[PDB]
Protein backbone atom coordinates (compact mmCIF):
# COMPACT_ATOMS: atom_id res chain seq x y z
CA UNK A 1 0.00 0.00 0.00
CA UNK A 2 2.91 2.34 0.73
CA UNK A 3 3.77 2.58 -2.97
CA UNK A 4 0.17 2.56 -4.27
CA UNK A 5 -1.22 5.87 -5.58
CA UNK A 6 1.68 8.00 -4.37
CA UNK A 7 0.33 10.67 -6.77
CA UNK A 8 -3.42 11.11 -7.13
CA UNK A 9 -4.90 11.39 -10.62
CA UNK A 10 -8.37 12.59 -11.71
CA UNK A 11 -9.84 9.24 -12.72
CA UNK A 12 -13.22 10.06 -11.18
CA UNK A 13 -13.66 13.12 -13.39
CA UNK A 14 -12.67 11.05 -16.42
CA UNK A 15 -15.23 8.31 -15.78
CA UNK A 16 -17.96 10.85 -14.98
CA UNK A 17 -17.38 12.55 -18.34
CA UNK A 18 -17.42 9.11 -19.98
CA UNK A 19 -20.69 8.30 -18.22
CA UNK A 20 -19.55 5.01 -16.72
CA UNK A 21 -16.87 3.23 -14.77
CA UNK A 22 -13.16 2.99 -15.51
CA UNK A 23 -10.84 0.48 -13.88
CA UNK A 24 -7.07 0.95 -13.96
CA UNK A 25 -4.12 -0.95 -12.58
CA UNK A 26 -0.57 0.00 -13.57
CA UNK A 27 2.67 -1.45 -12.22
CA UNK A 28 6.18 -0.03 -12.46
CA UNK A 29 8.13 -3.29 -12.48
CA UNK A 30 11.31 -1.56 -11.33
CA UNK A 31 10.15 -0.03 -8.08
CA UNK A 32 6.88 -1.86 -7.49
CA UNK A 33 4.95 1.40 -7.42
CA UNK A 34 1.37 1.15 -8.65
CA UNK A 35 -1.58 3.23 -9.79
CA UNK A 36 -4.93 1.71 -8.85
CA UNK A 37 -8.49 2.89 -9.48
CA UNK A 38 -11.42 0.47 -9.23
CA UNK A 39 -8.67 -2.10 -9.70
CA UNK A 40 -10.39 -5.02 -7.97
CA UNK A 41 -13.80 -4.55 -9.58
CA UNK A 42 -14.88 -7.00 -12.25
CA UNK A 43 -15.15 -5.89 -15.87
CA UNK A 44 -16.01 -8.00 -18.94
CA UNK A 45 -12.97 -9.33 -20.77
CA UNK A 46 -14.58 -9.14 -24.23
CA UNK A 47 -11.89 -9.92 -26.82
CA UNK A 48 -9.09 -9.27 -24.31
CA UNK A 49 -9.22 -12.90 -23.12
CA UNK A 50 -7.55 -13.82 -26.42
CA UNK A 51 -4.14 -12.69 -25.20
CA UNK A 52 -4.32 -15.10 -22.26
CA UNK A 53 -5.68 -17.74 -24.64
CA UNK A 54 -2.55 -17.47 -26.79
CA UNK A 55 -0.37 -17.63 -23.68
CA UNK A 56 -2.15 -20.81 -22.61
CA UNK A 57 -1.54 -22.32 -26.05
CA UNK A 58 2.14 -21.43 -25.75
CA UNK A 59 2.27 -23.06 -22.31
CA UNK A 60 0.77 -26.24 -23.78
CA UNK A 61 3.35 -26.12 -26.59
CA UNK A 62 6.13 -26.45 -24.01
CA UNK A 63 4.99 -30.05 -23.48
CA UNK A 64 3.80 -30.69 -27.07
CA UNK A 65 6.58 -29.68 -29.45
CA UNK A 66 4.47 -30.24 -32.58
CA UNK A 67 1.46 -28.22 -31.42
CA UNK A 68 2.20 -24.82 -32.96
CA UNK A 69 2.89 -26.26 -36.41
CA UNK A 70 -0.28 -28.36 -36.42
CA UNK A 71 -2.56 -27.49 -39.39
CA UNK A 72 -6.20 -26.85 -38.41
CA UNK A 73 -8.95 -27.11 -41.04
CA UNK A 74 -12.38 -25.68 -40.24
CA UNK A 75 -15.73 -25.37 -41.92
CA UNK A 76 -17.72 -22.31 -42.86
CA UNK A 77 -19.80 -22.89 -39.71
CA UNK A 78 -16.73 -21.91 -37.64
CA UNK A 79 -16.63 -18.40 -39.15
CA UNK A 80 -18.52 -16.29 -36.65
CA UNK A 81 -18.61 -12.49 -37.06
CA UNK A 82 -15.24 -10.69 -36.84
CA UNK A 83 -12.98 -13.42 -38.26
CA UNK A 84 -10.93 -11.28 -40.69
CA UNK A 85 -7.92 -13.60 -40.95
CA UNK A 86 -9.49 -17.05 -40.67
CA UNK A 87 -12.06 -16.20 -43.35
CA UNK A 88 -9.19 -15.78 -45.84
CA UNK A 89 -7.86 -19.30 -45.10
CA UNK A 90 -11.17 -21.16 -44.91
CA UNK A 91 -10.29 -23.19 -47.98
CA UNK A 92 -6.73 -23.94 -46.83
CA UNK A 93 -6.61 -24.16 -43.03
CA UNK A 94 -4.17 -22.38 -40.72
CA UNK A 95 -1.67 -23.57 -38.14
CA UNK A 96 -2.23 -23.34 -34.38
CA UNK A 97 0.46 -20.65 -34.24
CA UNK A 98 -1.24 -18.72 -37.07
CA UNK A 99 -4.59 -18.96 -35.29
CA UNK A 100 -2.93 -17.68 -32.11
CA UNK A 101 -1.37 -14.74 -33.94
CA UNK A 102 -4.72 -13.95 -35.59
CA UNK A 103 -6.59 -14.12 -32.27
CA UNK A 104 -4.08 -11.74 -30.66
CA UNK A 105 -3.27 -9.35 -33.50
CA UNK A 106 -6.60 -9.16 -35.37
CA UNK A 107 -8.89 -10.30 -32.53
CA UNK A 108 -10.11 -13.09 -34.83
CA UNK A 109 -13.19 -14.75 -33.28
CA UNK A 110 -13.18 -18.04 -35.23
CA UNK A 111 -9.51 -18.46 -34.35
CA UNK A 112 -10.31 -17.87 -30.69
CA UNK A 113 -13.05 -20.50 -30.65
CA UNK A 114 -10.82 -23.04 -32.41
CA UNK A 115 -8.05 -22.48 -29.86
CA UNK A 116 -10.48 -22.63 -26.95
CA UNK A 117 -11.47 -26.09 -28.23
CA UNK A 118 -7.80 -27.11 -28.18
CA UNK A 119 -7.58 -26.15 -24.50
CA UNK A 120 -10.81 -27.83 -23.41
CA UNK A 121 -13.03 -24.76 -23.57
CA UNK A 122 -13.54 -21.83 -21.19
CA UNK A 123 -12.86 -23.98 -18.12
CA UNK A 124 -9.54 -25.04 -19.64
CA UNK A 125 -8.42 -21.44 -20.11
CA UNK A 126 -9.62 -20.63 -16.58
CA UNK A 127 -7.57 -23.57 -15.29
CA UNK A 128 -4.46 -22.21 -17.00
CA UNK A 129 -5.01 -18.84 -15.33
CA UNK A 130 -5.42 -20.56 -11.97
CA UNK A 131 -2.14 -22.40 -12.60
CA UNK A 132 -0.24 -19.09 -12.75
CA UNK A 133 -1.88 -17.86 -9.54
CA UNK A 134 -4.77 -15.80 -10.95
CA UNK A 135 -7.83 -16.46 -8.75
CA UNK A 136 -9.96 -13.70 -10.33
CA UNK A 137 -10.06 -14.50 -14.04
CA UNK A 138 -13.02 -16.49 -15.29
CA UNK A 139 -14.01 -17.47 -18.80
CA UNK A 140 -17.41 -19.11 -18.95
CA UNK A 141 -18.64 -18.90 -22.56
CA UNK A 142 -17.47 -18.96 -26.18
CA UNK A 143 -17.52 -16.35 -28.94
CA UNK A 144 -19.78 -14.51 -29.35
CA UNK A 145 -21.90 -15.09 -26.25
CA UNK A 146 -19.08 -14.06 -23.89
CA UNK A 147 -19.48 -10.42 -25.02
CA UNK A 148 -22.89 -9.82 -23.41
CA UNK A 149 -21.36 -7.58 -20.69
CA UNK A 150 -24.50 -7.70 -18.53
CA UNK A 151 -24.23 -5.40 -15.47
CA UNK A 152 -23.41 -7.44 -12.38
CA UNK A 153 -22.77 -10.67 -14.31
CA UNK A 154 -19.43 -12.13 -13.30
CA UNK A 155 -19.24 -14.51 -16.26
CA UNK A 156 -16.33 -13.79 -18.61
CA UNK A 157 -14.80 -11.15 -16.37
CA UNK A 158 -11.63 -10.31 -14.55
CA UNK A 159 -10.27 -7.31 -12.66
CA UNK A 160 -7.77 -4.73 -13.96
CA UNK A 161 -5.40 -5.77 -11.18
CA UNK A 162 -5.51 -9.50 -11.95
CA UNK A 163 -5.16 -8.81 -15.68
CA UNK A 164 -2.03 -6.75 -15.01
CA UNK A 165 -0.59 -9.25 -12.55
CA UNK A 166 -1.09 -12.16 -14.93
CA UNK A 167 0.21 -10.19 -17.91
CA UNK A 168 3.36 -9.40 -15.93
CA UNK A 169 3.87 -13.06 -15.02
CA UNK A 170 3.48 -14.20 -18.62
CA UNK A 171 5.49 -11.48 -20.43
CA UNK A 172 8.20 -10.60 -17.89
CA UNK A 173 8.06 -13.23 -15.15
CA UNK A 174 8.55 -16.97 -15.31
CA UNK A 175 5.07 -18.34 -16.06
CA UNK A 176 6.22 -19.22 -19.59
CA UNK A 177 9.57 -20.66 -20.60
CA UNK A 178 11.85 -18.10 -22.22
CA UNK A 179 11.20 -18.93 -25.92
CA UNK A 180 7.44 -18.99 -25.41
CA UNK A 181 7.58 -15.78 -23.37
CA UNK A 182 9.30 -13.96 -26.23
CA UNK A 183 6.78 -15.35 -28.72
CA UNK A 184 3.92 -14.06 -26.57
CA UNK A 185 5.58 -10.64 -26.35
CA UNK A 186 6.12 -10.62 -30.11
CA UNK A 187 2.47 -11.42 -30.79
CA UNK A 188 1.36 -8.60 -28.48
CA UNK A 189 3.83 -6.17 -30.05
CA UNK A 190 2.32 -6.95 -33.44
CA UNK A 191 -1.24 -6.18 -32.42
CA UNK A 192 -3.06 -4.13 -35.06
CA UNK A 193 -6.24 -3.17 -33.15
CA UNK A 194 -4.91 -0.93 -30.36
CA UNK A 195 -3.50 2.18 -31.99
CA UNK A 196 -6.13 4.43 -30.40
CA UNK A 197 -5.95 3.00 -26.86
CA UNK A 198 -2.91 2.51 -24.57
CA UNK A 199 -0.56 2.93 -27.55
CA UNK A 200 -1.90 6.44 -28.12
CA UNK A 201 -0.57 7.40 -24.68
CA UNK A 202 2.87 5.79 -25.20
CA UNK A 203 5.70 7.63 -27.02
CA UNK A 204 6.46 6.22 -30.45
CA UNK A 205 10.08 5.39 -29.54
CA UNK A 206 9.01 3.01 -26.72
CA UNK A 207 8.16 -0.63 -27.39
CA UNK A 208 4.65 -1.77 -26.52
CA UNK A 209 2.53 -4.88 -26.82
CA UNK A 210 -1.16 -4.96 -26.13
CA UNK A 211 -4.50 -6.71 -26.47
CA UNK A 212 -7.84 -4.90 -26.81
CA UNK A 213 -11.45 -5.82 -26.15
CA UNK A 214 -14.72 -4.25 -27.36
CA UNK A 215 -17.90 -6.00 -26.20
CA UNK A 216 -20.16 -3.74 -28.28
CA UNK A 217 -22.69 -3.06 -25.51
CA UNK A 218 -22.79 -1.37 -22.10
CA UNK A 219 -19.98 1.00 -23.00
CA UNK A 220 -17.66 -1.96 -22.37
CA UNK A 221 -14.16 -1.91 -23.86
CA UNK A 222 -10.62 -2.35 -22.66
CA UNK A 223 -6.90 -2.71 -23.35
CA UNK A 224 -3.92 -4.14 -21.49
CA UNK A 225 -0.29 -3.63 -22.34
CA UNK A 226 3.35 -4.11 -21.48
CA UNK A 227 5.34 -0.94 -22.20
CA UNK A 228 9.13 -0.72 -22.38
CA UNK A 229 10.24 2.90 -21.86
CA UNK A 230 13.81 3.42 -22.89
CA UNK A 231 16.12 3.68 -19.94
CA UNK A 232 13.79 2.39 -17.17
CA UNK A 233 12.04 -0.83 -16.23
CA UNK A 234 8.90 -1.93 -18.08
CA UNK A 235 5.40 -0.90 -17.06
CA UNK A 236 2.43 -3.26 -17.13
CA UNK A 237 -1.07 -1.82 -17.17
CA UNK A 238 -4.74 -2.57 -17.76
CA UNK A 239 -7.60 -0.17 -18.52
CA UNK A 240 -11.18 -1.52 -18.52
CA UNK A 241 -14.46 0.34 -18.98
CA UNK A 242 -18.17 -0.32 -18.64
CA UNK A 243 -21.32 1.82 -18.46
CA UNK A 244 -24.82 1.30 -17.08
CA UNK A 245 -26.97 1.27 -20.23
CA UNK A 246 -26.94 -1.33 -22.98
CA UNK A 247 -26.66 1.31 -25.70
CA UNK A 248 -23.97 3.40 -23.98
CA UNK A 249 -21.04 3.76 -26.35
CA UNK A 250 -17.48 2.75 -25.58
CA UNK A 251 -14.70 5.30 -26.02
CA UNK A 252 -11.18 4.65 -27.27
CA UNK A 253 -10.18 8.18 -26.25
CA UNK A 254 -11.19 7.53 -22.64
CA UNK A 255 -8.97 4.43 -22.54
CA UNK A 256 -6.03 6.42 -23.93
CA UNK A 257 -6.69 9.22 -21.45
CA UNK A 258 -6.81 6.77 -18.54
CA UNK A 259 -3.51 5.24 -19.68
CA UNK A 260 -1.96 8.72 -19.76
CA UNK A 261 -3.11 9.37 -16.20
CA UNK A 262 -1.70 6.02 -15.09
CA UNK A 263 1.72 6.79 -16.59
CA UNK A 264 1.64 10.26 -15.04
CA UNK A 265 0.79 8.67 -11.70
CA UNK A 266 3.88 6.49 -11.96
CA UNK A 267 6.11 9.47 -12.71
CA UNK A 268 6.94 8.05 -16.13
CA UNK A 269 7.83 10.99 -18.38
CA UNK A 270 6.04 10.33 -21.65
C1 LIG B 1 -13.58 -8.46 -29.16
O1 LIG B 1 -13.90 -7.83 -28.18
N1 LIG B 1 -14.23 -8.45 -30.33
C2 LIG B 1 -13.57 -8.91 -31.55
C3 LIG B 1 -13.62 -7.84 -32.64
N2 LIG B 1 -12.70 -6.71 -32.30
O2 LIG B 1 -11.92 -7.00 -31.23
S1 LIG B 1 -11.21 -5.68 -30.56
O3 LIG B 1 -12.17 -4.67 -30.57
O4 LIG B 1 -11.01 -6.09 -29.11
O5 LIG B 1 -9.94 -5.59 -31.19
C4 LIG B 1 -15.05 -7.38 -32.86
C5 LIG B 1 -15.71 -6.90 -31.57
C6 LIG B 1 -15.59 -7.89 -30.41
C7 LIG B 1 -16.66 -8.98 -30.44
N3 LIG B 1 -17.93 -8.58 -30.41
O6 LIG B 1 -16.32 -10.17 -30.47
Swiss-Prot record:
Residues engaged in binding a beta-lactam = 47, 50, 82, 107, 109, 212, 214
- Answer whether the UniProt record assigns the keyword Hydrolase to this protein: yes
GO terms for biological process, alphabetical:
beta-lactam antibiotic catabolic process; response to antibiotic
Molecular functions (GO terms):
beta-lactamase activity
Q: Which reaction does it catalyse?
A: a beta-lactam + H2O = a substituted beta-amino acid
User: What other comment is given for this protein?
Assistant: Initially two different KPC beta-lactamases were identified from two different Klebsiella (KPC-1 and KPC-2); they were later shown to be identical.
Please give the superkingdom of this protein's source: Bacteria
Q: What is the species of this protein?
A: Klebsiella pneumoniae
Q: What does this protein do?
A: Class A beta-lactamase which confers resistance to the beta-lactam antibiotics, including penicillins, cephalosporins and carbapenems. Acts via hydrolysis of the beta-lactam ring. Has penicillin-, cephalosporin- and carbapenem-hydrolyzing activities.
Q: Where is the active site?
A: 47 (nucleophile), 145 (proton acceptor)
Q: Does the keyword GTP-binding apply?
A: no
The cross-references to SUPFAM superfamilies, in alphabetical order and at most eight, read:
beta-lactamase/transpeptidase-like
The protein's name in its UniProt record: Carbapenem-hydrolyzing beta-lactamase KPC-2
Upon changing residue 156 to N, the result is: Reduces thermal stability of protein
Amino acid sequence: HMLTNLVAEPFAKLEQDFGGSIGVYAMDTGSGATVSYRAEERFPLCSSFKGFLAAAVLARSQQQADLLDTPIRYGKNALVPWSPISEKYLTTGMTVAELSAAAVQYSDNAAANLLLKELGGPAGLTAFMRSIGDTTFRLDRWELELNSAIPGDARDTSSPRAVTESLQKLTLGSALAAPQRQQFVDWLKGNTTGNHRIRAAVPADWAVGDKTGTCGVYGTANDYAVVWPTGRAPIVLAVYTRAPNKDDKHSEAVIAAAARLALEGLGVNG
